[PDB]
């Protein structure tokens, strides 16, 4: 379970980091 | 405690997957 | 270690919520 939890939260931060980059670009392109 | 963490972890991951979907749609819509 | 995982999960959720608000604003202004 601990591995399971560490892996899922890592995955979460990695995808969150990536979406922040995408949102930052859309924001610039937009208004 | 560990169980309530898993709960938050799985919830965060689900919302991240949804956001990915929202962002793919926005990137296409905005171009 | 449990506390580091809890910090990470909370940061993960904070970012997620924040991205939901950013996406929500983009969608309202996009159209
Ligand atoms: Zn992407
Ligand atoms: Zn949505
Ligand atoms: Zn922001």
Write down the domain spans for chain A.
Answer: 1-26
Exp. method: X-ray
Q: CA-to-CA distance for A30 and A27, rounded, in angstroms?
A: 5
- Please tell me what resolution, in angstroms, this structure has: 1.9
Contact C23, B19 (CB under 8 A): yes
Ligand 3 geometric centre to CA of A17 (Å):
12
Contact A29, B26 (CB under 8 A): no
Q: CA-to-CA distance for A21 and A2, rounded, in angstroms?
A: 29
Count CB atoms within 10 A of the CB of residue C26: 20
Chain breaks after residues in chain A, where C lies over 2.5 Å from next N: none
Burial of residue B6 (number of CB atoms within 10 Å: 0-12, 13-18, 19+) = middle
Q: CA-to-CA distance for B2 and B28, rounded, in angstroms?
A: 39
Closest CA to A22 of B29, B11, C8, B9: B29
On chain B, the residues whose CB falls within 8 A of the CB of C26 are: 26
Give ion ligand 1 contacts, CB < 5 A.
A 22
Closest CA to C8 of B17, B1, A7, A1: A7
What does DSSP assign to residue B31? -
Phi, psi at A17, each rounded to 5°: -60, -45
Counted across chains B and C, CB pairs separated by less than 8 A come out at 32
């Amino acid at each position: 379970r601990m591995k399971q939890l560490e892996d899922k939260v890592e995955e979460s931060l990695s995808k969150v980091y990536h979406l922040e980059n995408e949102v930052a670009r859309l924001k610039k392109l937009v208004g």
